[PDB]
RNA sequence: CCCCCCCCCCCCCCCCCCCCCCCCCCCCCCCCCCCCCCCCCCCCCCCCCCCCCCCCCCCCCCCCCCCCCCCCCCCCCCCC
């Protein structure tokens, strides 16, 4: 376990990964450090890593398609990763094959970001997901082609402050899944308020 | 056994002049190549300064909400 929360890491983007000798590393916290550039091969050889926290950082550019050199898939080879946190990273786009190898992911956190559109068929490999947290984002539509495999068998859901769109093309499957479910959705009728169109403005 | 004087023709040598043909050097013009310097055309790379745009982090301010601690008051009831 190596905790580096709010330590302002510098020279973190070296060509050889400093966590390469850490073969038995299981918990790694890199939160509140304003890390900007992260290499692709930083977590190579980290088969036994389970807990990864990268919340409150600046990795928005690393996932956009306009980033030179291509998006950074720094989550490859993490077969045993269990809890992942990416809060307040300012993410605006998620690459399609970033979560391709997380076969044992159960807890994922993506709140307080600028997510608006997610690629279709991204959460196929998370067959053992438990909690999905997307509070305080800019998402507007929830559909099967992206959130179908995500909502297979969960236990928690955190999507409070989002401007949901009330349209049969964008929310009908979502509200249908709300009607019958066993996942714990707290304050479902308090902050899951429809922002757009103004006809359904504020309607749960 | 004799010298002299005239003339024709053909020689040889030497000085001058005029012809071709060639060599060397030089002059003028032009062309080609090499080197040096300079000007212009663009397309740029690197560095610095200035100005903005996005995202994020620390600190601070304002408005709150919850919890904890302390103080006061109102009503009800007992002890001596």
Author numbering: 484 to 687
From the paper:
The ligand-binding site involves both the N and C-terminal parts of the TLR3 ectodomain.
The electron micrographs show that the majority of the ectoTLR3s are in the clustered state. Interestingly, the C-terminal ends of the TLR3 ectodomains in the cluster point to the same direction even without the transmembrane and intracellular domains. Several factors can contribute to the ordered assembly of TLR3 along the dsRNA strands. First, as shown in Fig. 2, the deletion of both the transmembrane and the intracellular domains did not change the structure of the receptor cluster. The closest contact area between the dimeric TLR3 units is composed of the negatively charged N-terminal and the positively charged C-terminal residues of the neighboring ectoTLR3 dimers. The distance between these charged areas is more than 6 angstroms and appears too far to be considered a strong interaction.
